[PDB]
Design a protein around this ligand. Structure first.
Ligand code: JF1
Ligand code: JF1
Ligand code: MG
Ligand code: MG
Ligand code: MG
Ligand code: MG
Ligand code: MG
Ligand code: MG
Lengths: 304, 304
């Protein structure tokens, strides 16, 4: 697998090591892992490492929050593959009022009190910025079990759906939270087109590196929860080529999106619309794209 | 536009200079051009040159037939852009009985007697092989004004339609005729997968190089006949990139179809299915793909 050249340079949060031990340690203590093999695979994935690659400029005392949220979402993402759409939906919907703090968790159920305590701790640190992550998370959760996954999609329709399933919006809200980066509604409206383009990069890069894993899952897990829903197989079907061929083509498209990102940001600046906050934001998006790819290239989650 | 590497070596018929002079001269005498500018643009296109690139192993006394047929089809292809779907259909349908030789041509109408005299001359040289080109040509002609051109299509649906609009079948039958290459029904059914793959390459390579021409046509010609129907526009729409970015990505896919062509040929031979006739056929298809591309890179039809 040979990735075409990119001009995006990845950055990792300085405290990645100590935060990793902290967050992995917490989940190894509280989360219901089935066995030792699963615990080792969990650590081998490096969910805090990818988070620190996502948000390398996160504040030192907020990066752990982001690591916890993405870690539990990664774990749930895998759980859903053994469920039907119905079971998966019931599972996520139960966590939504708990995430809001409107419903108390069952303390005997790890996922519930982990989710509850997390959001409570985030609201305690920064109430306004924490609340703005909620609905983007709920949007992502509901996309995970959407029956549209089991229906024919073209590349365009897929990317539109996958913007929710890849959690583009929650990642943006979480990035801002972790950086303490407050943006006005008008500012956010200005970078909407940039966000949409960034989403496609995130989605397809992940699709390429995680295809072998998801292929195996589709053959072994639940026929619904583990269904093969990805740009790799969509393009392979549309063009009647192998998945390996589709990856090579999609890789080139990812670099086109990197080029579009730079063009859109350059236009934003030229029109005098790139505020200091917006400048930090679009740079943050670039970190997400390059960080995700670096991790995807090396994580044992995708290679084994 | 820098084309990605291809292992295909394009070949041109040895008699290209003499035949091009002959056929161009024929159409300059008989065809009705609006002005001297159109007459020069016609010669600059090199319609006999691309034919000799399509079928470089055509027999020396048959290549001029192919040159004449593709030339008039190219001319008509352009005429249809200034018509509605209804008018274009009426234009083509009148030429079909004349092509069969069932209806005498109006000698005052160039397109009618050119078509009549051509097909008569082809049946005179090789009746059986000439007749086998008829229905594939009619299939192409009727695709040109198909209402599906005015309906939204995905990449997969488009390529299935374009196989007829790109004249894949007529090119196959014309190639066999020009080479005197006879194949059994068993041999023909055997390579349907190879044909379908080849068709995609012919279509998308053409879409890439002819996009600028067809963009202009969509803005100036008839709202129906000049409508933009191309994989470049479809991929640009679905992936949210420029047409130029779509071209670069589609070109990579074309190289994947080239690889798949070689894979399918090797498999046909790895089994017990590659006859000497089939070997000549699939090699001929490679010439169509590489030849069309070579011409598309230098013809004034697409550059200006
Ligand atoms: C940033 C990405 C490409 C996605 C990688 C996979 N994970 C799964 C758990 C939830 C995350 C938001 C994400 C979908 C992000
Ligand atoms: C071989 C091709 C890529 C097509 C180029 C355009 N011409 C138009 C006139 C009729 C031909 C069959 C073709 C559609 C072939
Ligand atoms: Mg997953
Ligand atoms: Mg998922
Ligand atoms: Mg994936
Ligand atoms: Mg046409
Ligand atoms: Mg045309
Ligand atoms: Mg064209």
């Amino acid at each position: 697998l040979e990735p075409p050249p990119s001009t995006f340079q990845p950055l990792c949060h300085p405290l990645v090591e100590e935060v990793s031990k902290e967050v992995d340690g917490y989940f190894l203590q509280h989360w219901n892992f089935p066995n030792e093999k699963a615990r080792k695979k969990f650590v081998a994935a490096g969910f805090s490492r990818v988070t620190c690659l996502y948000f390398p400029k996160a504040l030192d005392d907020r990066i752990h929050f982001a690591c916890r949220l993405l870690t539990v979402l990664f774990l749930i993402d895998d759980l859903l593959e053994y469920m039907s759409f119905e079971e998966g939906s019931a599972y996520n919907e139960k966590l939504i009022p708990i995430s809001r703090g409107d419903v108390l968790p069952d303390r005997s159920i790890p996922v519930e009190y982990i989710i509850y305590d997390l959001w409570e701790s985030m609201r305690a640190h920064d109430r306004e910025m924490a609340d703005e992550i909620l609905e983007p998370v709920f949007l992502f959760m509901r996309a995970q079990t959407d029956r549209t996954r089991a229906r024919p999609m073209g590349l365009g329709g897929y990317l539109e759906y996958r913007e929710r399933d890849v959690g583009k919006e929650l990642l943006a809200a979480l990035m801002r939270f972790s950086m303490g980066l407050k943006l006005s509604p008008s500012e956010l409206q200005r970078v909407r087109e940039i966000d949409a383009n960034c989403s496609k990069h995130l989605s397809v890069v992940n699709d390429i590196y995680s295809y072998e894993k998801e292929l195996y899952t589709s053959k072994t897990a639940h026929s619904e929860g583990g269904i093969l829903c990805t740009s790799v197989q969509i393009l392979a079907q549309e063009a009647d080529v192998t998945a390996e061929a589709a990856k090579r083509v999609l890789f080139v498209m990812c670099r086109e999106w990197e080029l579009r990102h730079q063009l859109l940001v350059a236009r934003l600046s030229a029109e005098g619309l790139e505020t200091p906050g917006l400048a930090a934001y679009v740079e943050g998006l670039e970190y997400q794209m390059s960080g995700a790819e670096l991790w995807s290239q090396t994580t044992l989650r995708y290679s084994v």
